Scaffold this active site. Structure first.
Site, PDB file in Angstrom:
ATOM      1  N   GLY B  32      -6.901  16.118   3.099  1.00 54.38           N
ATOM      2  CA  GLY B  32      -6.971  17.035   1.964  1.00 54.38           C
ATOM      3  C   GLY B  32      -7.786  18.291   2.256  1.00 54.38           C
ATOM      4  N   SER B 102      -5.253  10.346   4.495  1.00 52.19           N
ATOM      5  CA  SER B 102      -5.736  10.691   3.131  1.00 52.19           C
ATOM      6  C   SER B 102      -4.584  11.248   2.311  1.00 52.19           C
ATOM      7  CB  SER B 102      -6.917  11.644   3.264  1.00 52.19           C
ATOM      8  OG  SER B 102      -7.778  11.458   2.132  1.00 52.19           O
ATOM      9  N   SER B 103      -4.717  12.413   1.701  1.00 49.96           N
ATOM     10  CA  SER B 103      -3.575  13.028   1.038  1.00 49.96           C
ATOM     11  C   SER B 103      -2.429  13.250   2.013  1.00 49.96           C
ATOM     12  CB  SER B 103      -3.962  14.317   0.340  1.00 49.96           C
ATOM     13  OG  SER B 103      -4.684  15.166   1.217  1.00 49.96           O
ATOM     14  N   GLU B 126      -5.441   5.573   5.913  1.00 48.70           N
ATOM     15  CA  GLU B 126      -6.372   5.648   4.765  1.00 48.70           C
ATOM     16  C   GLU B 126      -5.755   6.459   3.607  1.00 48.70           C
ATOM     17  OE1 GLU B 126     -10.478   6.354   6.084  1.00 48.70           O
ATOM     18  OE2 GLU B 126     -10.482   4.362   7.031  1.00 48.70           O
ATOM     19  N   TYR B 187      -7.215  17.999  -5.887  1.00 45.81           N
ATOM     20  CA  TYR B 187      -6.744  16.749  -5.229  1.00 45.81           C
ATOM     21  C   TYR B 187      -7.177  15.436  -5.898  1.00 45.81           C
ATOM     22  CZ  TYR B 187      -4.516  19.211  -1.277  1.00 45.81           C
ATOM     23  OH  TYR B 187      -3.681  19.949  -0.480  1.00 45.81           O
ATOM     24  N   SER B 220     -13.149   0.473   0.828  1.00 45.69           N
ATOM     25  CA  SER B 220     -12.542   1.805   0.674  1.00 45.69           C
ATOM     26  C   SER B 220     -11.014   1.707   0.710  1.00 45.69           C
ATOM     27  CB  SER B 220     -13.044   2.735   1.745  1.00 45.69           C
ATOM     28  OG  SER B 220     -14.416   2.964   1.601  1.00 45.69           O
ATOM     29  N   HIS B 242     -12.604   8.116   8.578  1.00 42.44           N
ATOM     30  CA  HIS B 242     -11.550   8.864   7.860  1.00 42.44           C
ATOM     31  C   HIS B 242     -10.951   9.951   8.764  1.00 42.44           C
ATOM     32  CE1 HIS B 242      -9.517   9.182   4.056  1.00 42.44           C
ATOM     33  NE2 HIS B 242      -9.880  10.468   3.804  1.00 42.44           N
TER      34      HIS B 242
HETATM   35  C1  LIG Z   1     -19.422  13.177  -4.290  1.00 39.59           C
HETATM   36  C2  LIG Z   1     -18.641  11.884  -4.148  1.00 39.59           C
HETATM   37  O1  LIG Z   1     -19.649  10.887  -4.092  1.00 39.59           O
HETATM   38  C3  LIG Z   1     -17.660  11.772  -2.944  1.00 39.59           C
HETATM   39  C4  LIG Z   1     -17.602  10.382  -2.236  1.00 39.59           C
HETATM   40  C5  LIG Z   1     -16.206   9.805  -1.893  1.00 39.59           C
HETATM   41  C6  LIG Z   1     -15.576  10.394  -0.611  1.00 39.59           C
HETATM   42  O2  LIG Z   1     -15.639  11.824  -0.788  1.00 39.59           O
HETATM   43  C7  LIG Z   1     -14.072  10.149  -0.383  1.00 39.59           C
HETATM   44  C8  LIG Z   1     -13.615   9.036   0.576  1.00 39.59           C
HETATM   45  C9  LIG Z   1     -12.192   9.304   1.117  1.00 39.59           C
HETATM   46  C10 LIG Z   1     -11.239   9.916   0.073  1.00 39.59           C
HETATM   47  C11 LIG Z   1     -10.673  11.146   0.217  1.00 39.59           C
HETATM   48  C12 LIG Z   1      -9.652  11.678  -0.737  1.00 39.59           C
HETATM   49  C13 LIG Z   1      -9.579  11.134  -1.994  1.00 39.59           C
HETATM   50  C14 LIG Z   1      -8.639  11.595  -2.883  1.00 39.59           C
HETATM   51  O3  LIG Z   1      -8.592  11.083  -4.140  1.00 39.59           O
HETATM   52  C15 LIG Z   1      -7.722  12.564  -2.539  1.00 39.59           C
HETATM   53  C16 LIG Z   1      -7.764  13.088  -1.263  1.00 39.59           C
HETATM   54  O4  LIG Z   1      -6.850  14.018  -0.921  1.00 39.59           O
HETATM   55  C17 LIG Z   1      -8.709  12.676  -0.350  1.00 39.59           C
HETATM   56  C18 LIG Z   1      -8.755  13.380   1.001  1.00 39.59           C
HETATM   57  O5  LIG Z   1      -9.824  13.420   1.781  1.00 39.59           O
HETATM   58  O6  LIG Z   1      -7.731  14.052   1.266  1.00 39.59           O
END
Ligand SMILES: C[C@H](O)CCC[C@H](O)CCC/C=C/c1cc(O)cc(O)c1C(=O)O
Ligand SMILES: C[C@H](O)CCC[C@H](O)CCC/C=C/c1cc(O)cc(O)c1C(=O)O
Ligand SMILES: [K+]
Ligand SMILES: [K+]
Lengths: 268, 269
Positions: B32, B102-103, B126, B187, B220, B242
């Site tokens: 993302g 991820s995305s 993931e 996102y 996760s 990730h």
């Molecule tokens: C400030 C807080 O505690 C932040 C703590 C949590 C970690 O940031 C995230 C862990 C991995 C998730 C990524 C993700 C999630 C999503 O719903 C859409 C997406 O597109 C992504 C992506 O990286 O693309």
């Protein structure tokens, strides 16, 4: 209100055990370190919901150390299951819910598959199915080096809560210090190959509830998630890592109570 | 030997993209944060094995920022898959192996299901299927606070390798600084509900290879392992967390090459 006593079984083991409460039996089987004081807070919380809760030190470990060498060498899930059945026979526990982590998890699945009339339902946590050469190789070290290395591994790698682990206190850690060499020379080469989860179809439809630690690195018990899903076995997470009854005792207690309640409903 | 250029698609996006190599097409879809410099070492190693490798910054992110607001707000897997097809159309890539994390994982599963004639095989890593309120709540914050919070999360919690993450360099981190608020607002609230994994039977038998990070906390992506297993999809681990293409680029490249080679053998059978 907690019984704390010893009982001898005809296989030669003098067990240290604890028991609290009245109602359906729940038995808490230790992990490979064999130390039942890790359950102390949870035992009272479970028993207070209307259960008879039993736990014990494992053969050769802590206060159950008066045992024949066979009971803590070349240890398998099937040997441990036979030993747990021996103490349940001695305590006249005919039908029990069982919990176990690690070699305890292997033990409770062996109990459910081998003694189905004796087991209401089993909760397994983080069941070891893979050999780890770094762990197996500690067996050839001196006792003091094993105890130093494995004390560090337990605290820093798998406790899931350093403050709660250290808060077990000097008396518990002194018993674990003496257990580490017994565990290292008896468990890591023989426990994983004995894992009673090679036959997926034998698990299907069984009263099994499987957990892994939420914080545990995915690689550690990835295979547990796969196997449970292939078998259609309930699989979920507890907070922490390898010792949820230490790191998160109130969440652990609630899980044991709710899972046992679900099987008591399903049994009628 | 790396082409570094731009291409405009009729949906309004001006993409920055890179391409290296000749042979069957492999496309690396970013996570993302939308930043394709994270694939730089791997693009060369993959292309060297006889593939044409294409990657790109994602719409509204880094050097693909010239894009309509629809492409970086209320983002779904389905929108992203439609945008990837637009750049593959523009580059005349008819049939491709695709990677995404991820995305990007949600994108590549949406591509495989929605555009099956275009996708030889997909590798997903993931794939987010759950809302995270603590991440969703960052959207209401000011840009500078979003950037500071998420820069810290990527470096210290999910990079899988803080030294490799820092070694992306000052220019990459300056782009990611500007992307963090766009990512936060477009996102986390909309990608997870759009996850194309509601129909396990739709995944069964598809040329999908699914991974999770070996060091990632079990909770996760526990749901990915369950879903893959229920669908009979190949599921395994890569080192790190990730960003395996950042933390373990040579392992990442080898996995992409071997997986593509496996599907090329199977397609000929
Ligand atoms: C400030 C807080 O505690 C932040 C703590 C949590 C970690 O940031 C995230 C862990 C991995 C998730 C990524 C993700 C999630 C999503 O719903 C859409 C997406 O597109 C992504 C992506 O990286 O693309
Ligand atoms: C120096 C080394 O690399 C040590 C690092 C690796 C960590 O020790 C993994 C820690 C937990 C091991 C559990 C386990 C394994 C087993 O094969 C039999 C068992 O009974 C258990 C158990 O705790 O009961
Ligand atoms: K707790
Ligand atoms: K590497």
């Amino acid at each position: 209100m907690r019984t704390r006593s010893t009982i001898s079984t005809p296989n030669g083991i003098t067990w240290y055990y604890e028991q609290e409460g009245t109602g359906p039996d729940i038995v808490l089987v230790p992990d490979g370190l064999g130390e039942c004081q890790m359950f102390d807070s949870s035992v009272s919380q479970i028993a207070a919901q209307g259960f008879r809760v039993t736990t014990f030190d494992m053969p050769g470990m802590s206060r159950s150390a008066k045992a024949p060498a066979e009971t803590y060498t070349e240890v398998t899930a099937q040997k441990l299951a036979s030993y747990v059945i021996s103490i349940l026979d001695a305590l006249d526990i005919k039908h029990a819910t069982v919990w176990g982590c690690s070699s305890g998890a292997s033990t409770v699945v062996a109990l459910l598959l081998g003694y189905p009339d004796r087991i209401r339902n089993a909760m397994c946590h983080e069941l070891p199915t893979k050999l780890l050469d770094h762990l197996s190789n500690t067996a050839v070290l001196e006792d003091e080096e094993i105890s130093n290395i494995l004390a560090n591994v337990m605290l820093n790698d798998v406790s899931g809560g350093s403050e709660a682990w250290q808060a077990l206190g000097v008396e518990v850690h002194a018993r674990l210090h003496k257990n580490y060499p017994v565990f290292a020379r008896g468990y890591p080469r023989t426990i994983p190959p004995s894992a009673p989860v090679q036959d997926v179809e034998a698990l299907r439809g069984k009263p099994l509830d499987w957990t892994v630690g939420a914080a545990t690195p995915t690689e550690s018990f990835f295979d547990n998630i796969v196997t449970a899903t292939k078998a259609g076995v309930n699989i979920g997470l507890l907070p922490g890592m390898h010792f949820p009854y230490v790191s998160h005792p109130d969440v652990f207690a609630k899980y044991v109570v709710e899972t046992t309640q679900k099987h008591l409903w399903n049994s009628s």
